[PDB]
């Protein structure tokens, strides 16, 4: 509830059908700004947000450069990770890494995180103290020991704390008009019935930005679906409760969002 910039990398081993798959997409808050796709035609870092389009060639050449290094690195990792676990070259496996910095209301550093995962589980993650690491397997400790000898941990700390927040503050200003904006949730409710003695009272929060929001019911027995994006920068989410009959007045939905100074309490009336 301040600001952040996080990159996400996913490299999947495609055994026998070429090289792995790699996707590097960059996010500023809930807004995607750049991407890279193993199997794209451009093979350069592409813009996915207008405030990023303005960046000179030297930048794009820059990130494209750095992004593919991230690629070579990630295909080496897969091979290395297969060895540790003694897995057959047959099956496919996934590598995911994510790192970036968090910045407060003042655009000053707050946190940083590296962390990597193999086949959907945590492998190793940089401790909040950006000095230590959290190793998961005994294999993950190999990587930890090694990384501790090289002082990789302290080379990252310089990034999360330095160049990351800088480039983040730079992103927020350069794209201010979209990033530094909020959108109060456009709420409403519906009444559907399950049977002849039960009805599904549903509460909606649409067109809001950022994605953080709190949908809450109250007369335990509440369906909540995960905040989904509408596709135009705003997000949606709804909450439902199977209310007994003629009992809909005793149910209140509550909305909480950065854009609502005071919450919205909407009742079926």
């Amino acid at each position: 509830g301040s600001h952040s910039m996080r990159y996400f990398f996913t490299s999947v081993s495609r055994p026998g059908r070429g090289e792995p798959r790699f996707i590097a997409v960059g996010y500023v808050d809930d807004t995607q700004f750049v991407r890279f796709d193993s199997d794209a035609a451009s093979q350069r870092m592409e813009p996915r947000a207008p405030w990023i389009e303005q960046e000179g060639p030297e930048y794009w050449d820059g990130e494209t450069r750095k992004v593919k290094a991230h690629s070579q690195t990630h295909r080496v990792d897969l091979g290395t990770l297969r060895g540790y676990y003694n897995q057959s070259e047959a099956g496919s496996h996934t590598v995911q890494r994510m790192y970036g910095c968090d910045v407060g209301s003042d655009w000053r550093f707050l946190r940083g995180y590296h962390q990597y995962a193999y086949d959907g589980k945590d492998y190793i993650a940089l401790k909040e103290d950006l000095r230590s690491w959290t190793a998961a397997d005994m294999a993950a400790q190999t990587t930890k020991h090694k990384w501790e000898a090289a002082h990789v941990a302290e080379q990252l700390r310089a990034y999360l704390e330095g160049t990351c927040v800088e480039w983040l503050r730079r992103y927020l200003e350069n794209g201010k008009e979209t990033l530094q904006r909020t959108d109060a949730p456009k709420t409403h409710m519906t009444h559907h019935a399950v049977s002849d003695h039960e009805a599904t009272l549903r509460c909606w929060a649409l067109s809001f930005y950022p994605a953080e929001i709190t949908l809450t019911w109250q007369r335990q027995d509440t369906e909540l679906v995960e905040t989904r994006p509408a596709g135009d920068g705003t997000f949606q989410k709804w909450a439902a409760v199977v209310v007994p009959s003629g009992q809909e007045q005793r149910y209140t939905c509550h909305v909480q969002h950065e854009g609502l100074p005071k919450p919205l309490t909407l009742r079926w009336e």
């Binding site: 990159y7 820059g62 750095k66 992004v67 190793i124």
Partner: peptide, 7 residues
């Protein structure tokens, strides 16, 4: 933008 070491 970005930064990576082998795992």
């Amino acid at each position: 933008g970005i930064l990576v070491f082998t795992x």
